[PDB]
């Protein structure tokens, strides 16, 4: 699983074993980033991000890895932040265009499809390099339901019940599997999200970290909003207490 004799310098070049190493390298750039998870409950989607703090000089809420893509769609990113922001711009513009053309809020599956196609468009030429980030799109509606999708640098898009991206992706996935989110609600879920974030976090290698949280569901009229300070501190308390067992 390691070839590199000129076959790994472009996305327009296949490896002799049929691989595009540039994309995989971008994925490795995603892997070196702090873990961000997101889980879908029966009444919406909750996002949680391990936002590592590189300096105490930085203001709180700086370098947000949680974005508002549309009034009904939120985005959680993992990896090279600038690319993630540009992708957030692309997603926003796609949703805006969809509204301006068809007259209603864009369905999440379609938005994910479009943006994913846009991402994939970068895994094919030597003129551009694949995006160095993976992201998750969360949304809720009454006519649509609760939905959570995920896109990697290759352009692959899939629908998840629970998902994680970053350093401890698997370590988080094993913790998410323990939950029964098909019956739980976004109110209860937040605590579990914060909990899994604190569990997966490595207090040794990585320094201090700030926790980001995001609602999107029936409790918010379908609007993707930031989790209020009350519920956030509550979930963090639950997490810090659950870390002593």
């Amino acid at each position: 699983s390691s070839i590199g004799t000129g076959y790994d310098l472009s996305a327009s070049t296949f490896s002799p074993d049929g691989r595009v190493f540039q994309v995989e390298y971008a994925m490795k750039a995603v892997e070196n980033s702090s873990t961000a998870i997101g889980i879908r409950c029966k009444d919406g989607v909750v996002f949680g991000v391990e936002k590592l703090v590189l300096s105490k000089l930085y203001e709180e809420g700086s370098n947000k890895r949680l974005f508002n893509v549309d009034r009904h769609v939120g985005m959680a990113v993992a990896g090279l932040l600038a690319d993630a922001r540009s992708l957030a711009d692309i997603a926003r513009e796609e949703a805006s265009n969809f509204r301006s053309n068809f007259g209603y809020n864009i369905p999440l599956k379609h938005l994910a499809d479009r943006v994913a196609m846009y991402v994939h468009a970068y895994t094919l030429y030597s003129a551009v390099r694949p995006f160095g980030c993976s992201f998750m799109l969360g949304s809720y509606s009454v006519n649509d339901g609760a939905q959570l999708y995920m896109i990697d640098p290759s352009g692959v898009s899939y629908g998840y019940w629970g998902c994680a991206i970053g350093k401890a992706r698997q370590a988080a996935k094993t913790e998410i599997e323990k939950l029964q989110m098909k019956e739980m609600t976004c109110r209860d879920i937040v605590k579990e999200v914060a909990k899994i974030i604190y569990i997966v976090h490595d207090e040794v290698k990585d320094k201090a970290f700030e926790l980001e949280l995001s609602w999107v569901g029936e409790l918010t009229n379908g609007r993707h909003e930031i989790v209020p300070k009350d519920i956030r501190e509550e979930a963090e308390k639950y997490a810090k207490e659950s870390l002593k067992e």
Binding site: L9, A29, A82, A127
Partner: protein, 238 residues
């Protein structure tokens, strides 16, 4: 060595060397400090000189009545980005008749600077910026890197030997929010001077100050106008 020369080439370790090499350009320039109180945003910049017969390099630039910047890196790229910010601000005033919110301008800087890091034959902007601004969310100090990443700061320092300034600011963050203007500029000047060996210190010839706030448009103090700030400072230790 084979992943060094193009911005469209990922390393097998998930890194882009051209971006990092561009990041190294910020450390090549003279250090600069930025801090905010609750009413004022302040940039203090250490101007550098080639010889004693050459005037000191400009480090603080005017963007809009409510926004100013301090540069660190390639002066050409700095001028480019500056003109871009100026243009965006002018556009905002032309269209909405209200000053452009600083955070949005920073976002636009991010979007613009991100583009050339993903296209063949293009290169990242070889310049770091400290942005001081005031809007109806208060004062703001922002930091922009060649990697097109930006940070909202309480205090920050970038450039040659800026580590000392950073270490200083990190201790006085708690003091910053309540300081008056003079104390704020003081702290900025101490942070700035920390990035110097004891054989040299601040002078009216090599220090520039940019101030913006609720009671003041962005202003630049360069020579004799800096003295009221320097005169009123400790003797520093060795």
């Amino acid at each position: 060595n084979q992943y060094d020369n193009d911005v469209t080439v990922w390393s097998p370790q998930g890194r882009i060397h051209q971006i990092e090499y561009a990041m190294e350009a910020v450390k090549q320039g003279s250090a600069t400090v930025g801090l905010k109180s609750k009413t004022h945003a302040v940039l203090v910049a250490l101007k550098r000189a080639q010889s004693e017969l050459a005037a000191h390099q400009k480090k603080i630039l005017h963007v809009d009545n409510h926004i100013g910047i301090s540069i660190a890196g390639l002066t050409a790229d700095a001028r480019l980005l500056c003109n871009f910010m100026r243009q965006e601000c002018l556009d905002s005033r032309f269209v909405f008749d209200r000053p452009l919110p600083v955070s949005r301008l920073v976002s636009l800087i991010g979007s613009k600077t991100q583009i050339p890091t993903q296209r063949y034959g293009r290169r990242p902007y070889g310049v770091g910026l400290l942005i001081a601004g005031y809007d109806d969310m208060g004062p703001h100090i922002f930091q922009t890197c060649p990697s097109a990443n930006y940070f909202d700061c309480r205090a920050m320092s970038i450039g040659a030997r800026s580590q000392s300034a950073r270490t200083y600011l990190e201790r006085h963050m708690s003091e910053f929010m309540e300081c008056n203007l003079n104390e704020l500029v003081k702290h900025g000047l101490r942070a700035l001077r920390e990035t110097l060996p004891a054989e040299q210190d601040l002078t009216t010839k090599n220090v520039s100050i940019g101030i913006v706030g609720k009671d003041l448009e962005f202003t630049i103090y360069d020579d004799d106008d800096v003295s009221p700030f320097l005169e009123g400072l400790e003797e520093r230790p060795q």
